[PDB]
Design a protein around this ligand. Sequence first.
Ligand code: SF4
Lengths: 49, 344, 232, 155, 33, 33, 33, 67, 56, 109, 109, 109, 109
Amino acid sequence: DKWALYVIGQYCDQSVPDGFGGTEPRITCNAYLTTQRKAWDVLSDFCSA
Amino acid sequence: NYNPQTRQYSGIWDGTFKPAYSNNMAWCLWDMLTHPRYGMGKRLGAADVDKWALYVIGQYCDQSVPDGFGGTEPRITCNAYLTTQRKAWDVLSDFCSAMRCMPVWNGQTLTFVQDRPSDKTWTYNRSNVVMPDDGAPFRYSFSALKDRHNAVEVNWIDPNNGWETATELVEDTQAIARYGRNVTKMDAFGCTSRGQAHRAGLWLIKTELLETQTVDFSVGAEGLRHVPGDVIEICDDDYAGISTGGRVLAVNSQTRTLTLDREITLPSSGTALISLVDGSGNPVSVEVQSVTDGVKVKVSRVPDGVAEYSVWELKLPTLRQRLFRCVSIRENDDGTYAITAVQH
Amino acid sequence: MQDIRQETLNECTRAEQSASVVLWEIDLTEVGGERYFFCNEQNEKGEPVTWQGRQYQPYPIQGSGFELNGKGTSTRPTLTVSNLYGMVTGMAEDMQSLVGGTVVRRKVYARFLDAVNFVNGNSYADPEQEVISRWRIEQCSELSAVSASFVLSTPTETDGAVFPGRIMLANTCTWTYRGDECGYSGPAVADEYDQPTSDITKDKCSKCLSGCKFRNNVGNFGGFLSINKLSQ
Amino acid sequence: MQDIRQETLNECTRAEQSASVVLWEIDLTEVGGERYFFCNEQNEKGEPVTWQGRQYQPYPIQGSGFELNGKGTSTRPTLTVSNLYGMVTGMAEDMQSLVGGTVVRRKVYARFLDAVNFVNGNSYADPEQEVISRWRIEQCSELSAVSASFVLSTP
Amino acid sequence: QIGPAALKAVYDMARKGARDEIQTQMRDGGLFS
Amino acid sequence: QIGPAALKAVYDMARKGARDEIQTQMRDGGLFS
Amino acid sequence: QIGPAALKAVYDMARKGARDEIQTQMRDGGLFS
Amino acid sequence: VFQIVLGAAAIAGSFFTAGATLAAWGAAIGAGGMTGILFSLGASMVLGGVAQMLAPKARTPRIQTTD
Amino acid sequence: AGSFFTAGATLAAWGAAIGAGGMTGILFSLGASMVLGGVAQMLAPKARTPRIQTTD
Amino acid sequence: MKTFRWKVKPGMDVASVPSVRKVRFGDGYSQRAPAGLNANLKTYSVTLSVPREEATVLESFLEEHGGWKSFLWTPPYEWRQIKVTCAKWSSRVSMLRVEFSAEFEQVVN
Amino acid sequence: MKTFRWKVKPGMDVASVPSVRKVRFGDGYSQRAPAGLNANLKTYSVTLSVPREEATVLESFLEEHGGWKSFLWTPPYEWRQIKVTCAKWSSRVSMLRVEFSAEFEQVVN
Amino acid sequence: MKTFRWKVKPGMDVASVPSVRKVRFGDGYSQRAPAGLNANLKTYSVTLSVPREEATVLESFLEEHGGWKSFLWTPPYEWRQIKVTCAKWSSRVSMLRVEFSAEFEQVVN
Amino acid sequence: MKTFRWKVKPGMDVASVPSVRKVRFGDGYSQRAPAGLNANLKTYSVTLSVPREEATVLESFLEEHGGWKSFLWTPPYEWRQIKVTCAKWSSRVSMLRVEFSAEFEQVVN
Ligand code: SF4
């Protein structure tokens, strides 16, 4: 479902207090996956972030 | 009678082992199983392990096969260096997976069943097997879609670059166009030659692609003739649209003819064969000449002492054998045996 | 909520409703077969049920285990069908046990069925009233002289997959021959054993460096031809 | 296939066959005991069953779980015996609960039994018709005032 | 139904169900038994 | 009680019991299933 | 038989069977439960 | 009279437990001579793959991040 | 282990009464289950050890 | 000895219940197949009334076969000789006569 | 052979028991549906009485179909010919007559 | 049609067995609650005797409803019109009359 | 005490029920074996009628053996002395007599 991911990305792009004084996007990437794990593990990590 | 340097056998064995250095993995397994000092010789001991099965296994492993670089190479070889202490089952399973055999307690000795092209031992039709309340004398099952692997990464150890783990990728691009792409990793236990690792991976892929279905066909009192790994034929008259098995009702030796249940149809071309049972359990096979109505079958020769209500089977030129190898036999505290088998 | 029409939602709340007919479709076109259409019942005229102008042939078929749960294991439904007269058997020996095919299930209220199904016709006939679900055949769990049971799975089913999948190897190409990454479009050169051939039906790559050189494709070689010495 | 004689194979395929007797032997000689021979039945003359010249004494005994499977867990049969009159109890307190002994099981068609077993004799008596299987005692799983169950295992 | 015979059947069905559940939990989500 | 319908109920109760036992063994002492 | 007590007995038998199967799978081949 | 021998369609929904109707067996709850609930090992033995029923699938050491 | 002694007591009087609210059935004596790991496990908790690391 | 040669009382039951393969899910389409080749082998609930002297002979005949060892019999129903097997044959020993209640299931082998 | 010609004497049982989908809500409310698509099939508890010489013909007719297969029959209930299958046909023999008790199940096929 | 307009025989059973919530452990203190709002919907074991000609009309009425589709009925018990549902309605077809045995369970919707 | 001296009036039931090993093959074929080695034992459904004074003696005799143990008895069926055990012996008291019902099971022991 691409529309569900569209709404999810819209939610993750919302600005929230940074905690230092400014603002910050709600949820972000910057992972570097090097080891080979099962696809369920990576999917669950993404869906838990 | 075995010369390890040339990997040749003289004649019949008779036993009587000899202390010579060899790379034969069957006898490396034999040493692992029956050594009193560091192996399992204190427990277990000799005369509990089938030495003849290991003899045939070592003969199979000594056969020459294409090297892949241009020459020839022994089929399966040792050169493992076991340093860590693992459970005996782990080492036994690695030994029995390096050379494709399964260890099973025969009943008097621990035998090994090796996946080899074998001839049929017995034939079972729907009149020779137990009928449950549902009309399913034979139940068939299939391996799942994701359990048919078409890509394997075999980890062998290269002695040329450096004694390190080299990964060899085996694939079957035809099956990748049918069952997605199911990839696995595997460790070749004794492999130090690229050919052996590729052969092991290819054996895994080919077994997953060719051998697909399994059967449960619990039989009567004859099941005490069966050991696991026995190859048998299943003449299921429901799997095929025709009838090719039954029981003999009457035998007329003079003017040789037979009476059977059901009705038999001759093929358009070729000579059909009928397999009867002699007067001493020998299952000879003879040739049919003509069939009247559908019951009176005239054969080339009536075997001696063919008794009434004995099992007969029909072999046609355009019918596949449908062989199955046994993997489990269970006594049912009834006189019946529950047999599981897989395609051959 | 599911996107279902207002007529079905109106029928769901009624005290006395029509029978719910489940229609099945087996789609083996992606695995080299045909499409079969089944319904557990005939109609009042002793004919196969006609839905949206398509006939669904009568055949004993029943599905179970259909549910939508995100937590835990992926749901694996089951589909039991009649194997009398050796019909499914004929599919198992022709389609590699039907594995990899698609199963489409439609729930339709009988009041919305096509007017041809009923003797007196259907004034409320509506071909747009259906609930559709798609699954895949994972394993023919049992096949006997009586019946056949199939395990179904969601098309996603991240069971045997890994991520990332591309593996770093030497002396072996991981690309697919004449694929996008391989990017080869030349004539027949050799087979998988490097023996030269002008036969297009016998043209395959050995996936070794020599096989790539045969096609002058070493630039697009999928292996890494130095890593074998740094791993010592 | 198992190496069994042609007479047993001929008998196995008959429509009407004889009773399949199962004779048990418990060998504790390797663990410092004796050998005890048992059969679940007497014979037609009310005597212990004589097989190959050896008397197998009547005693309630029954084995189950016997199978030949290579894949998965090694098969562990079970053997239930009568503990009335405290006989097995006496064996448990003298042989460390029989642990480590051997159990030999013979399947014999009753038609091949010794002629002494039957009043009218046995013309087809054949002492070489038997199917033998050896197992080891692993644990006396239950011992009560009524029965006693032993776990068996491959050697 | 006599209890002595039915109890063994229930035990064997329970063993089969336990094996099936264990094999099910070794799938992706599950519990890995 | 007809056997065909009761066997499914026994199998499903066995499945539930197996799941409960597995979850119980994942506790401290237990067996970690 | 009455359904309540029969269902409870089936549940305990299923639990026992599950525990036995778990302890069986921890042997050599098995599944290690 | 019969041996039921449960398969896979029976356990996956009671659609074919009544296919054999289990009438005379259930009325006789079984027997001491013969046992029910055979539970054919067809699909259970093949879960890991056909190649698992012929070879024991040698194991490999755990992957360590030290290397 | 086989319905050999379920009919040894024949279970007839209990089965005909399916049980009771006062008393429970299926007691399942824990004799052989508690002794599977060994007698020394019923008295001590069998202290654990770290996993062997190849880095060492 | 291989032929039941006694006479049965008037009222005897003949049950058939043939064996067929049935496929029907719920109350939808149904498919029926003849299953095996020897579909129905019937069952005769035979009853006899014999003097106390011949009860010993009848019981000896029934006991020697002992469940197995089918014997030849011509039922008064179709008058065709068949092969049958008996398994219960209860008896009741009145003051002057004894009644036998036996079940004959016909076989093929 | 297609048609059943024998006649039923005493008064039979004509059982309908249609299959419905029923859901019971809370305070007395419910929800009902006809489950299937083509009515209920209905079954007849039929019983014949025949001379001892014609019982063989009746058994041959009932055994030819052998549980499966259907024959035409016009019940003396609605006088509309229907297709039926018989699967038990118990029979009791007597001195001069044979009494059959059978269950005819109507089938669409 | 929506009203049962036939007459029932004298002997008719009316069962009530209302639905309540019971909490009682062992034989100690017990608590009872009325559970739902439409407590008891009763059940009437109706028997009818009709000539063979009108049995067709009676079965057509009972079959068109087909388990669902409750119909209006005034029992001779409290003389209050209610809505009832039938699910079995077996029948016996004698030489001159037919006896219907049906169960009418009253509903709300 | 070894021998049973009382006499059985009404006509008992002598049930044999031999134990056989039976395997049912497919299209009508089978395989049968006698299972055991020494015949079938047979059981007698015996009833005594005794005066109210001798009932105590009969009870003492049947209670001394107490379910286990065997006593000699010559049944009025074959007139061959056999060893039997009794395990229930229900008894109904009356004004002047007592009626015992019991099941005597023959034992090799
Ligand atoms: S080796 Fe070269 S030609 Fe062959 S598949 Fe790889 S990229 Fe293509």
